[PDB]
Amino acid sequence: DMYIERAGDITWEKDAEVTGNSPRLDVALDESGDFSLVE
Amino acid sequence: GETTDGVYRVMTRRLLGSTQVGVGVMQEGVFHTMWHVTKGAALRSGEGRLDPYWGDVKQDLVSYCGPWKLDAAWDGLSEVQLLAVPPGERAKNIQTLPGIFKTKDGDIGAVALDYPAGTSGSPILDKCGRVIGLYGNGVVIKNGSYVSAITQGKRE
Ligand SMILES: Cc1cc(CO)c2cccc(NC(=O)[C@H]3CC[C@@H](N)CC3)c2n1
Does B136 touch chain A if contact means CB atoms closer than 8 Å? Predict the structure, then answer.
């Protein structure tokens, strides 16, 4: 039996840790909602 | 139960201790997470009960108490923030310019940030604070690192 607990407001915070890249990926989506890479 | 707007952890006690299985967004009296977090199970908010209202295994989305309410979309240009809520750890904004999932059916935003499975359902935001989608359905790339879709539902 699952329960929810609050964790924060939903707000944009100026000067947050900027990171990660922007990869363009060819992908497929099966009927079970699994993304896969098409190569 | 607590129906105040914002981000919530999704906990279970079925396993050892209390385990974070994912995250969701409360907005307009509706709770929004990804299907693989709850598998469509009812949820508890204090003594209140949240019942599933809509769900799709292929979108990997589910809503509680009402229809999907989040309809903002990535503009295709601007940086976003992932409001990561990791297990045992305080909520943390991470700013990023998303990549792209290219599929036969069109283009989806993708955020290249690796976090634990239990972070699934953390919201991804735009500069106006609107939720443009949820983190935690994606793919492990050539490198071995995780990339998530920006998964957004339809508001009817
Ligand atoms: C291997 C791995 C790793 C991480 C972190 O490194 C993950 C972080 C969040 C979510 C994951 N799961 C998914 O993206 C989905 C795959 C199929 C879908 N139908 C339901 C879940 C993660 N999977």
Answer: no
CB-based contact A22 B57, cutoff 8 Å: no
Technique that determined the structure: X-ray
Note the resolution in Å, 1 decimal: 1.7
CB burial of B21-57 (b: ≥16 within 10 Å; e: otherwise) equals bbbbbbbeebbbbbbbbbeeeebebeeeebebebbee
The answer, yes or no, to whether any atom of ligand 1 lies below 6 A from the CB of B36, is: yes
Residues of chain B with CATH 2.40.10.120: 6-64
Nearest CA to ligand 1 atom 23: B117
The domain defined by B6-64 folds into Thrombin, subunit H (2.40.10)
Which residue spans of chain B are classified as CATH 2.40.10.10?
A: 80-149
